[PDB]
């Protein structure tokens, strides 16, 4: 399946 | 459909973060109208 979006910035 | 184009919001557990799409950017500040 597709990747989980991208994470948030630290 | 409430953010720019290429925008969505994404959920964690810590609170909400947006996603550009096309350029894979994420962010916490609301990236506007």
Redesign the interface.
């Known amino acids: 399946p597709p990747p989980p979006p991208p994470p948030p910035p630290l | 459909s409430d953010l720019p184009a290429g925008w969505?919001r994404?959920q964690?557990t810590s609170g909400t973060?947006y996603?550009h799409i096309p350029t894979?950017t994420?962010?916490?500040e609301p990236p506007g109208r």
């Open positions: 969505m994404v964690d973060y996603w894979g994420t962010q916490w």
